[PDB]
Design an enzyme around this catalytic site. Structure first.
Site, mmCIF file in Angstrom:
data_model
loop_
_atom_site.group_PDB
_atom_site.id
_atom_site.type_symbol
_atom_site.label_atom_id
_atom_site.label_comp_id
_atom_site.label_asym_id
_atom_site.label_seq_id
_atom_site.Cartn_x
_atom_site.Cartn_y
_atom_site.Cartn_z
ATOM 1 C CB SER A 1 36.867 -6.395 9.817
ATOM 2 O OG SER A 1 36.670 -4.839 9.882
ATOM 3 C CE1 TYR B 1 27.911 -5.387 11.788
ATOM 4 C CE2 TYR B 1 25.859 -3.726 12.410
ATOM 5 C CZ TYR B 1 26.166 -4.820 11.249
ATOM 6 O OH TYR B 1 25.849 -5.670 10.618
ATOM 7 C CG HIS C 1 33.985 -8.084 18.813
ATOM 8 N ND1 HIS C 1 33.491 -7.192 17.281
ATOM 9 C CD2 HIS C 1 35.068 -7.012 18.817
ATOM 10 C CE1 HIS C 1 33.658 -5.835 16.437
ATOM 11 N NE2 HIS C 1 34.726 -6.502 17.590
#
Ligand SMILES: [Cl-]
Ligand SMILES: [Cl-]
Ligand SMILES: [Cl-]
Lengths: 276, 276
Positions: B181, B27, B32
Site C-alpha cells: 500500500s 506513488y 499497481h
C-alpha cells in the site's frame, strides 16, 4: 419501430453512434412530438423512453395516479418515426439491490422546485444518469417547460463528463397559451379555463421588460395577472438569471421569468425568457 | 507513453474501443503494476490515471500528507507499457462550479470502512464515475486489498449501467505478509515489524475455517492474533458475505475475513477469503 422492455434487449438493438434520445414519463402529447421531431432531424437513430420514475415523486404527490397508456404512446411514437421505444417496468429499471443515487447539490437544486419538491431532482438526476448510460446517446432532448430540470441535467452532464449534448426545446402551448403537459389531464373543465394564467403572468412581465420597465415593475405586472385567479395558489413568481436561477436586481440577456403554483387538482409550472 | 493532464487532451488521445483502465492515486508500487500488467495483456490500449482525489479524504485524514512523486510514476508506467497516463490537477477534475455527487447507499457503504471514514465512499464513487465517463473503458482494474471499495464500484456500475467490466486483482504481499500500500511509507521501522499482524489475524481465521471450525471460532482466533499487538488499535474484525459485507451467521463460499485498525503513524486494512 421496435419496443423493448428490458435492458438486455435495449443494449442489443442499439447502434454505437448517431443516437438521438428523448426521455419521457409517457402519456405523450404534441410537446413530446416536438422533441422527437427535433431528434430526428439531427440524428440517424432515435430512441425514446417511457418510464414513470418513482424516485422523482414525493410521498404525497401523484405517482399512483400519474396518467398511463403505453399503447397510445406506442402508436404515436411509431407514427413519429421513432426507431426504438424503451418501456421498462420499475423492476427492470431498479432491480432488487439497487442502491445508487446521483444528485446535483447547491442552489441550483435547492431553489424553486427544489424547495417545493424535496428529493425530486435527486430522482431526476439518478434516472437520467442511468438512462444515459444505457442508451449512450449523442444528443438528448428535454423541454424548456421544466427549465430548472434542464439546467440540473446540464450541470450533471458537465460535472460527470457525460459525452452527451443536452438540447432544450422550446415549449409547445395550447392556443390560449397553456403549456402542454401530461398532467394537464387532471384539470377539470372549469380549471382548464383558468390555467392559462401562468403564461399570461409570464407574458405580462415580458411586456413590461420590452417597454423598458424595471425588473421590479415586471414582477408587479406578473403578480397582478395571477391575482385575477384566486384559485391558483402561487408557490413562486420570479425573474432570474438564466444559468444560476438567482433573482435579478437588474436585467440580463436571457433573464428568465418562472412561475409555479397549484389548483386543487393539479400543480402547474411554466417559464419564459423575458429579456431582451 | 503519452502523458496528458487535461480532459481535452485525454479525449483526443483515447481510442474508441479496447481500452483497459487502471485508476490510482500515485506513488505506485509492485501491486499497481500487477494491475497495469493484467490490463496490458487483456486490452489493446491501456490507460492509467494518477490523481489524489480530495473528495475521498475526510476530517483528520492524510490528504496533504499523502505521498506524491509524479515523475517516478511516469517512468514506471512507461516501462510497464501503458499507452496513456492521465494525471490531472484538482482544478481540471473539479472545475469551479462542480456540484455533482454519486453515492452508493445502504449497508455496503455504511459498514466497516464506511463507518470509520464517513463520506469516503461518496468521494470514491464520484471520482470513479467521472473517470469511467471520461475514459469510456471496456475494463477497469482494481486491487482486492480495498475489497469494500471494489464491491462499491461494482454496485455503482451494476446500478447505473456503466458498460464497464470491473476486474478485481488479488493483493500483492511482502515476504512477511504485509499487503502492499502506498501508505506503508508512513510506517516506522518499528511499527513496520508489527504491521504483519493484520495478515496474521486473517490467516488465523482461514486456518480455523479450514479445520472445520465455526465462524465464531474463526473470529476468536483472529481476535487472539490482534490481542498480541495492542499497538494496533482495531477498527473492526469480521467474517462477512463476499457480496453484501454483512456479518455471517454461518459459512458461505467466498466468506471474507476483513480487518482494519491504526498504528500511531498510519491506518491499515486487509482482507482475505477465509472459506472454503
Ligand atoms: Cl415529476
Ligand atoms: Cl410532460
Ligand atoms: Cl483514501
Amino acid at each position: 419501430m421496435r419496443t423493448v422492455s428490458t435492458v438486455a434487449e435495449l443494449r442489443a438493438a442499439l447502434p454505437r453512434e448517431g443516437v438521438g434520445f428523448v426521455p419521457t414519463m409517457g402519456y405523450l402529447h404534441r410537446g413530446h412530438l416536438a422533441l422527437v421531431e427535433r431528434a430526428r432531424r439531427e440524428n440517424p437513430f432515435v430512441v425514446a423512453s417511457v418510464f414513470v420514475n418513482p424516485l422523482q415523486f414525493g410521498p404525497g404527490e401523484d405517482y399512483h395516479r400519474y396518467p398511463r397508456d403505453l399503447e397510445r404512446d406506442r402508436a404515436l411514437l411509431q407514427e413519429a418515426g421513432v426507431d426504438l421505444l424503451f418501456a421498462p417496468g420499475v423492476e427492470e429499471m431498479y432491480p432488487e439491490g439497487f442502491a445508487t443515487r446521483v444528485q446535483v447539490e447547491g442552489p441550483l437544486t435547492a431553489l424553486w422546485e427544489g424547495a417545493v419538491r424535496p428529493g425530486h431532482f435527486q430522482g431526476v438526476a439518478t434516472v437520467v444518469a442511468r438512462l444515459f448510460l444505457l442508451v449512450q446517446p449523442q444528443r438528448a432532448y428535454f423541454g424548456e417547460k421544466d427549465y430548472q430540470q434542464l439546467l440540473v441535467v446540464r450541470r450533471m452532464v458537465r460535472d460527470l463528463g457525460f459525452p452527451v449534448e443536452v438540447v432544450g426545446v422550446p415549449t409547445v402551448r395550447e392556443e390560449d397559451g397553456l403549456a402542454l403537459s401530461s398532467r394537464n389531464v387532471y384539470l377539470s373543465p372549469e380549471t382548464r379555463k383558468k390555467a392559462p394564467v401562468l403564461y399570461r403572468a409570464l407574458l405580462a412581465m415580458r411586456e413590461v421588460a420590452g417597454q423598458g420597465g424595471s425588473v421590479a415593475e415586471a414582477l408587479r405586472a406578473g403578480e397582478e395577472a395571477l391575482r385575477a385567479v384566486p384559485e391558483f395558489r402561487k408557490d413562486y413568481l420570479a425573474i432570474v438569471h438564466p444559468e444560476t436561477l438567482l433573482p435579478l436586481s437588474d436585467w440580463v440577456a436571457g433573464a428568465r421569468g418562472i412561475v409555479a403554483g397549484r389548483f386543487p387538482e393539479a400543480r402547474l409550472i411554466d417559464n419564459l425568457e423575458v429579456y431582451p
